[PDB]
Amino acid sequence: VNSFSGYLKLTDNVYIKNADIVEEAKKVKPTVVVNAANVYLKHGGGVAGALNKATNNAMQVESDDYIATNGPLKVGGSCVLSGHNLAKHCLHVVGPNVNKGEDIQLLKSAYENFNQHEVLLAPLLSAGIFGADPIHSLRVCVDTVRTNVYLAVFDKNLYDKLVSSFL
Ligand SMILES: Nc1nc(N)c2ncn(Cc3csc(Cl)n3)c2n1
Secondary structure, eight states, X not given: OOSOOSOEEOSSSEXXXXXXXXXXXXXXXXXXXXXXXXXXXXXXXXXXXXXXXXXXXXXXHHHHHHHHHHXXXXXXXXXXXXXXXXXXXXXXXXXXOGGGTOOTTHHHHHHHGGGGSSEEEEOOTTOGGGOSOHHHHHHHHHHHOOSEEEEEEOOHHHHHHHHHTOO
16 A cells, blocks of 8 residues: 555556646655656756756756766666655656657667666656657556556646547
C-alpha cells in the first residue's frame, strides 16, 4: 500500500491520472519523481521548468554542479539527484526530443531507466514540447516499464484522448 490516489489502472503495473506533476508530487512526496530532462539538465520548460520552479531553483543549482563534474547525459539516459521539496529523489530521464531531430527509437531506452526504481511518479516522456506522439509514448511505457509507475498527464483533453484510445 502506497499514497497515490485517484488513478485509473491501465495494466498490472501502470496507472494514470489527469494531474499537474508539481501538485501531484507536493501532495504525495513520492520516493521518486521523474523529470523530463534534457542532456544539459537545463530546466527551462515543460515538466523540468515547472519542477525546478517549485524547488525555488535548487534543482537547477544542483544540476549545474552535476554537469560541471560529469558532463551531459545521453539521450535515452538518466541520473538520480535530489527530489528537494517534491520527492526523496528526482530521476532525470532524457527522452528523444522530436523537435530537435533526436531518434524516437530511444524512447524505449529512456523508459528502461524506470525499471531501476520500484515505484515512480512520472510524466509521459517525449510528449508535449518534446514533439512525440503521446499515444505512442504511453504504449512504449506500458510495454517497457515493469516497475510500478504512476503517470500524470496535465492536459485534460490529452488525458481524455489517451484513455479512450488505450488498447
Ligand atoms: N503531468 C504533467 N505536469 C506538468 N506540469 C506538465 N507540463 C508539461 N507536461 C507534459 C510533458 C511530458 S514530457 C514533457 Cl517535455 N512535457 C506536464 N505533465
